[PDB]
Enzyme design. Structure first.
Site, PDB file in Angstrom:
ATOM      1  N   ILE A  21     -51.083 -19.171 -67.249  1.00 42.90           N
ATOM      2  CA  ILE A  21     -49.980 -19.911 -67.857  1.00 42.90           C
ATOM      3  C   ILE A  21     -49.462 -19.369 -69.186  1.00 42.90           C
ATOM      4  O   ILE A  21     -48.261 -19.194 -69.364  1.00 42.90           O
ATOM      5  CB  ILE A  21     -50.380 -21.381 -68.103  1.00 42.90           C
ATOM      6  N   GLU A  23     -50.759 -17.262 -73.229  1.00 43.70           N
ATOM      7  CA  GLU A  23     -51.706 -16.526 -74.044  1.00 43.70           C
ATOM      8  C   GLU A  23     -51.523 -16.848 -75.513  1.00 43.70           C
ATOM      9  O   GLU A  23     -50.480 -17.351 -75.925  1.00 43.70           O
ATOM     10  CB  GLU A  23     -51.617 -15.021 -73.791  1.00 43.70           C
ATOM     11  N   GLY A  24     -52.564 -16.584 -76.288  1.00 43.89           N
ATOM     12  CA  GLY A  24     -52.604 -16.841 -77.716  1.00 43.89           C
ATOM     13  C   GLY A  24     -53.322 -15.704 -78.427  1.00 43.89           C
ATOM     14  O   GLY A  24     -53.880 -14.811 -77.787  1.00 43.89           O
ATOM     15  N   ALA A  25     -53.311 -15.715 -79.754  1.00 39.11           N
ATOM     16  CA  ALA A  25     -53.973 -14.645 -80.480  1.00 39.11           C
ATOM     17  C   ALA A  25     -55.459 -14.609 -80.137  1.00 39.11           C
ATOM     18  O   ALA A  25     -56.013 -13.542 -79.894  1.00 39.11           O
ATOM     19  CB  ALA A  25     -53.782 -14.831 -81.975  1.00 39.11           C
ATOM     20  N   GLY A  27     -56.772 -17.069 -77.775  1.00 33.58           N
ATOM     21  CA  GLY A  27     -56.953 -17.903 -76.602  1.00 33.58           C
ATOM     22  C   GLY A  27     -56.046 -17.605 -75.426  1.00 33.58           C
ATOM     23  O   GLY A  27     -55.004 -16.985 -75.579  1.00 33.58           O
ATOM     24  N   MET A  28     -56.469 -18.022 -74.238  1.00 30.22           N
ATOM     25  CA  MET A  28     -55.682 -17.838 -73.025  1.00 30.22           C
ATOM     26  C   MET A  28     -55.671 -19.136 -72.222  1.00 30.22           C
ATOM     27  O   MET A  28     -56.673 -19.837 -72.173  1.00 30.22           O
ATOM     28  CB  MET A  28     -56.250 -16.693 -72.188  1.00 30.22           C
ATOM     29  N   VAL A  29     -54.547 -19.459 -71.593  1.00 29.63           N
ATOM     30  CA  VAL A  29     -54.452 -20.677 -70.799  1.00 29.63           C
ATOM     31  C   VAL A  29     -54.133 -20.373 -69.338  1.00 29.63           C
ATOM     32  O   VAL A  29     -53.198 -19.637 -69.044  1.00 29.63           O
ATOM     33  CB  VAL A  29     -53.392 -21.639 -71.366  1.00 29.63           C
ATOM     34  N   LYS A  44     -58.200 -23.774 -70.995  1.00 32.18           N
ATOM     35  CA  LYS A  44     -57.935 -22.964 -72.171  1.00 32.18           C
ATOM     36  C   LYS A  44     -59.188 -22.261 -72.666  1.00 32.18           C
ATOM     37  O   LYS A  44     -60.074 -22.886 -73.236  1.00 32.18           O
ATOM     38  CB  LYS A  44     -57.349 -23.829 -73.287  1.00 32.18           C
ATOM     39  N   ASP A 139     -46.785 -26.683 -85.776  1.00 28.61           N
ATOM     40  CA  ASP A 139     -46.276 -25.648 -84.889  1.00 28.61           C
ATOM     41  C   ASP A 139     -45.434 -26.197 -83.749  1.00 28.61           C
ATOM     42  O   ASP A 139     -45.569 -25.752 -82.614  1.00 28.61           O
ATOM     43  CB  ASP A 139     -47.395 -24.758 -84.353  1.00 28.61           C
TER      44      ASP A 139
HETATM   45  C1  LIG Z   1     -53.925 -20.110 -76.068  1.00 21.08           C
HETATM   46  O1  LIG Z   1     -53.431 -21.273 -76.639  1.00 21.08           O
HETATM   47  C2  LIG Z   1     -52.194 -21.061 -77.255  1.00 21.08           C
HETATM   48  C3  LIG Z   1     -51.388 -22.343 -77.291  1.00 21.08           C
HETATM   49  N1  LIG Z   1     -50.949 -22.838 -75.982  1.00 21.08           N
HETATM   50  C4  LIG Z   1     -51.548 -23.973 -75.471  1.00 21.08           C
HETATM   51  O2  LIG Z   1     -52.567 -24.459 -75.936  1.00 21.08           O
HETATM   52  C5  LIG Z   1     -51.007 -24.469 -74.227  1.00 21.08           C
HETATM   53  C6  LIG Z   1     -51.524 -25.338 -73.252  1.00 21.08           C
HETATM   54  C7  LIG Z   1     -50.574 -25.462 -72.257  1.00 21.08           C
HETATM   55  C8  LIG Z   1     -50.494 -26.209 -70.996  1.00 21.08           C
HETATM   56  N2  LIG Z   1     -49.540 -25.761 -70.167  1.00 21.08           N
HETATM   57  C9  LIG Z   1     -49.399 -26.432 -68.989  1.00 21.08           C
HETATM   58  N3  LIG Z   1     -48.410 -25.970 -68.135  1.00 21.08           N
HETATM   59  C10 LIG Z   1     -47.391 -25.040 -68.337  1.00 21.08           C
HETATM   60  C11 LIG Z   1     -46.630 -24.723 -69.438  1.00 21.08           C
HETATM   61  C12 LIG Z   1     -45.782 -23.720 -68.998  1.00 21.08           C
HETATM   62  N4  LIG Z   1     -45.981 -23.414 -67.719  1.00 21.08           N
HETATM   63  N5  LIG Z   1     -46.990 -24.244 -67.321  1.00 21.08           N
HETATM   64  C13 LIG Z   1     -47.475 -24.173 -65.944  1.00 21.08           C
HETATM   65  N6  LIG Z   1     -50.116 -27.491 -68.581  1.00 21.08           N
HETATM   66  C14 LIG Z   1     -51.054 -27.906 -69.447  1.00 21.08           C
HETATM   67  C15 LIG Z   1     -51.304 -27.313 -70.675  1.00 21.08           C
HETATM   68  C16 LIG Z   1     -52.378 -27.861 -71.579  1.00 21.08           C
HETATM   69  N7  LIG Z   1     -49.494 -24.682 -72.614  1.00 21.08           N
HETATM   70  C17 LIG Z   1     -49.767 -24.086 -73.804  1.00 21.08           C
HETATM   71  C18 LIG Z   1     -48.899 -23.146 -74.579  1.00 21.08           C
HETATM   72  C19 LIG Z   1     -49.827 -22.124 -75.297  1.00 21.08           C
HETATM   73  C20 LIG Z   1     -50.327 -21.098 -74.263  1.00 21.08           C
END
Ligand SMILES: COCCN1C(=O)c2cc(-c3nc(Nc4ccnn4C)ncc3C)[nH]c2C[C@@H]1C
Length: 343
Positions: A21, A23-25, A27-29, A44, A139
């Site tokens: 889904i 990426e982060g500095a 972390g990865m999702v 995550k 943010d």
């Molecule tokens: C590595 O961390 C960096 C910050 N970060 C998050 O914490 C996070 C969590 C989600 C998230 N995204 C979806 N779905 C979704 C978003 C866009 N496409 N789809 C399928 N469902 C549940 C969650 C909890 N999106 C994000 C955006 C970024 C990646």
């Protein structure tokens, strides 16, 4: 042990069928199928141990999100990690899966006024709760705003979130900042650390403007350029606005600029609702003390069809108040302790 985009996720065997889904500095999702609940979930992976700043944020994120329970905020369903401190390489956060985020939607879809009004409503409802806990997100941006088929909005990515510290907000001119540039309040560039609630209100304004045009309102290509995009629209700050900026480097910089006039919201957004532009004007105020607070934004005529004080919950227990000095090792210990309950 499946892999995605170069990272290994040790979520076996409860969660399978992974996809990527975001990426982060640090972390990865990724999406995954959870056998116990028989549904798709977001996972995550966070790798914060190598760096100290990352350990602070991670602890702050886990603690905040475990605290919160709101329909408009992402929660934590589960926390996967190794059974011992020595074996703990990564920390895995299980959250509900959302269909998409506002960033992705805006890239391909035009929003109707109804959608805009309702999206803004849920952002402010979620933010009212965040702020009532004495928490600043710091943010807010479209990729941090998740949506589902029926248009429910949830706020995620609390990694940069802090407890509010208004007293310690002041700082020097051009002081470096982590949070996404396009959504940074003008004060960050001049005299603020981003430790007041008004910081999030400014971000919400930028999102509202991006919902009205499908284009970021202040797309500065660098730190100083960001300020000049803001003044390009807001016009030169008034005498009273400049008087609240006492550090001279920031003041003298504003005074050295040629006089630019305020671009009208109607000229920028000719198809927009007049009430929507009135609220946008309040949110995008150069002076942070004159800027609308989250509770007043909810009470605004643009949201009168959704406004309900009774149906806008506040945190039951707000956060009262030092990881700045604590090394990567002591922080690894608190993270391990905060994730204990999920084993
Ligand atoms: C590595 O961390 C960096 C910050 N970060 C998050 O914490 C996070 C969590 C989600 C998230 N995204 C979806 N779905 C979704 C978003 C866009 N496409 N789809 C399928 N469902 C549940 C969650 C909890 N999106 C994000 C955006 C970024 C990646």
């Amino acid at each position: 042990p499946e892999m995605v985009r170069g990272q290994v996720f040790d979520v076996g065997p409860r969660y399978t069928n992974l996809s990527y889904i975001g990426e982060g500095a640090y972390g990865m999702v990724c999406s995954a199928y959870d056998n116990l609940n028989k549904v798709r979930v977001a996972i995550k992976k966070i790798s914060p141990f190598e760096h100290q700043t990352y350990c602070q944020r991670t602890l702050r994120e886990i603690k905040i999100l475990l605290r919160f329970r709101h329909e408009n905020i992402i929660g934590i369903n589960d926390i996967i990690r190794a059974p011992t401190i020595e074996q703990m390489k990564d920390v895995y956060i299980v959250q509900d899966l959302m269909e998409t985020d506002l960033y992705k939607l805006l890239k391909t879809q035009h929003l109707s006024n109804d959608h805009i009004c309702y999206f803004l409503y849920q952002i402010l409802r979620g933010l009212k709760y965040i702020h009532s806990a004495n928490v600043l997100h710091r943010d807010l941006k479209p990729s941090n705003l998740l949506l589902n088929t029926t248009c429910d909005l949830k706020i995620c990515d609390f990694g940069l979130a802090r407890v509010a510290d208004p007293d310690h907000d002041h700082t020097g001119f051009l002081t470096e900042y982590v949070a996404t540039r396009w959504y940074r309040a003008p004060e960050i560039m001049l005299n603020s650390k981003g430790y007041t609630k008004s910081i999030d209100i400014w971000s919400v304004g930028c999102i509202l403007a991006e919902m009205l045009s499908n284009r970021p309102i202040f797309p500065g290509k660098h730190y100083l350029d960001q300020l000049n995009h803001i003044l390009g629209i807001l016009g030169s700050p008034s005498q009273e606005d400049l008087n609240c900026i006492i550090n001279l480097k920031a003041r003298n910089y504003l005074l050295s600029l040629p006089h630019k006039n305020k671009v009208p919201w109607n000229r920028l957004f000719p198809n927009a609702d007049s009430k929507a532009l009135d609220l946008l004007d309040k949110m995008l105020t150069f002076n942070p003390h004159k800027r609308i607070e989250v509770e007043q934004a909810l009470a605004h005529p643009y949201l009168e069809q959704y406004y309900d004080p009774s149906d806008e919950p506040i945190a039951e227990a707000p956060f009262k108040f030092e990881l700045d000095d604590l090394p990567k090792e002591k922080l690894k210990e608190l993270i391990f302790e905060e994730t204990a309950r999920f084993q």
